[PDB]
């Protein structure tokens, strides 16, 4: 995969404990994870888990009441993943039989028929993945399958490559672009309509990096296209609306999973300081696992669109203007 991202310090220690073979043969870049504290007790599913680097990492972070599932279709990668279950149970939880992980073989677009067992409806709290979408062009079925396995309050928390415009037919047929995850890149606005068709009505930017195309033969197929690496979080929450409405609410981060909670690029909550929120963000806080570390005030009368944020114009803007402006400048 990419050059991608720097490994956060809290993970470094845990990676030193992970079997060297799992690390050595792992395909692609690490799945990024929500703040570590927020994972305790969660059920996490990694799509495209490979040899299990991210599954084993999460295994420790979710603790013994948490559970982790990895899914993949590369036989060679799973055989490796499957045979370090005990290794890691001992090393994390003092015994070979106390494992909170499992590995499933199947296409990520169809988790219900993955091979030891399927993933049932409404059973996962967090689905993670890094750079898996641009390799299939049935993105839609993949988004609907993630919607299906998530419980209410669950999130798809993921990184992929997107484009600031629609690639040409020629760019989408190119095999070098394809294998770099560029050629299957969605236009951000098409991505937004598509995950909303799958049921995720609200997409929050966590971070964005520029992705460059340098080879001058390649650049000719995608001449003014700007590509981005975006981490988004998309919550499955029954009451989310298409718009960000002010109902007079504020939320207060109570402490206990960091100095401050960073929900997305528009909303940071310093410990014990109330922050005005739109009702979608109130509802995410309330119905997701995050409620344990927050206090959210009651809905008042509808006050119109939410403006009580210092980037409120960008907050309401299409996804490509958010990404474009938050990348740099």
Residues that bind ligand RXO (CB under 6 A): 1-2, 131, 161, 180-181, 211
Choose the contact partner of 88 out of Mg ion, ligand RXO, Na ion, none; CB within 5 to 8 A by kind.
Answer: Na ion
Closest CA to 109 of 77, 133, 74: 133
Choose the contact partner of 267 out of Na ion, Mg ion, ligand RXO, none; CB within 5 to 8 A by kind.
Answer: none
Q: In a 3-state reduction of DSSP, which class is residue 102?
A: strand
Q: Cβ atoms within 10 A of the Cβ of 296, count? A: 20
Interacting residues toward Ca ion by CB under 5 A: 28, 48, 50, 164, 226
**Residue 19 vs 205, nearer CB to ligand RXO:** 205
Alpha helices in 165-253 (DSSP H): 169-173, 175-179, 188-197, 216-219
* Torsion sign across C-alpha atoms 44, 189, 277, 10: positive
Closest contact distance (angstroms) between CB of 143 and ligand RXO is 17
Of the residues 42, 89, 156, 315, which one makes contact with Na ion according to CB under 5 A = 89
**Residue 29 vs 205, nearer CB to ligand RXO:** 29
- Round to whole Å and give the CA distance between 241 and 237: 10
- Round to whole Å and give the CA distance between 42 and 35: 12
- Examine residue 162 and tell whether it contacts Mg ion (CB under 5 A): no
**Residue 115 vs 241, nearer CB to Mg ion:** 241
Of the residues 249, 280, 288, 309, which one makes contact with Mg ion according to CB under 5 A = 249
Determine whether the annotation assigns residue 226 to a binding site: yes
Choose the contact partner of 167 out of ligand RXO, Mg ion, Na ion, none; CB within 5 to 8 A by kind.
Answer: none
Determine whether the annotation assigns residue 18 to a binding site: no
What number of residues does the chain have? 329
All residues at 6 or more sequence positions from 255 whose CB lies less than 8 Å from its CB, including other chains: 271, 272, 293
Determine whether the annotation assigns residue 28 to a binding site: no
Q: Which helix (H) or strand (E) holds 283?
A: helix 279-287
- Examine residue 279 and tell whether it contacts Mg ion (CB under 5 A): yes
Q: In a 3-state reduction of DSSP, which class is residue 11?
A: helix
**Which residue numbers belong to the known binding site for Ca(2+)?**
48, 164, 226, 324
**Which residue numbers belong to the known binding site for S-adenosyl-L-methionine?**
27, 72, 77, 108-109
């Amino acid at each position: 995969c990419k050059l991608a991202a720097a490994v956060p310090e809290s993970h470094r220690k845990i990676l030193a404990d992970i079997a060297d073979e799992v690390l050595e043969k792992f395909y692609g870049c690490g799945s990024t994870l929500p703040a570590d504290g927020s994972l305790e007790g969660a059920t996490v599913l990694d799509l495209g888990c490979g040899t299990g680097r991210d599954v084993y990492l999460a295994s420790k972070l979710v603790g013994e009441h948490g559970k982790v599932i990895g899914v993949d279709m590369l036989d060679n990668q799973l055989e490796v993943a499957r045979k370090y279950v005990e290794y890691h149970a001992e090393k994390f939880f003092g015994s070979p039989s106390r494992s909170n992980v499992r590995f499933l073989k199947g296409f990520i677009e169809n988790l219900a028929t993955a091979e030891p067992e399927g993933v049932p409806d409404s059973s996962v709290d967090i689905v993670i993945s890094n750079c898996v979408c641009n390799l299939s062009t049935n993105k839609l079925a993949l988004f609907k399958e993630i919607h299906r396995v998530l419980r209410d309050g669950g999130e798809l928390y993921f990184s992929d490559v997107y484009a600031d415009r629609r690639l040409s037919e020629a760019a989408q047929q190119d095999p070098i672009l394809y294998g770099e995850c560029l050629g299957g890149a969605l236009y951000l606005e098409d991505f937004r309509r598509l995950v909303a068709e799958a049921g995720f009505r609200d997409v929050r930017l966590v971070s964005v990096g520029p992705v460059d195309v340098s080879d001058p033969q390649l650049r000719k197929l995608v001449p003014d296209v700007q590509f981005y690496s975006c981490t988004f979080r998309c919550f499955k929450v029954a009451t989310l609306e298409a718009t960000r409405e002010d109902y007079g609410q504020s939320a207060t981060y109570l402490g206990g999973i960091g100095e401050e909670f960073k929900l997305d690029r528009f909303f940071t909550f310093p410990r014990e300081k109330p922050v005005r929120v739109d009702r979608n963000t109130a509802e995410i806080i309330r119905h997701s696992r995050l409620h344990q570390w927050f206090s959210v005030s009651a809905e008042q009368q509808h006050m119109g669109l939410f403006k009580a944020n210092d980037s409120y114009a960008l907050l309401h803007a299409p996804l490509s203007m958010q990404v474009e402006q938050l990348v740099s400048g």
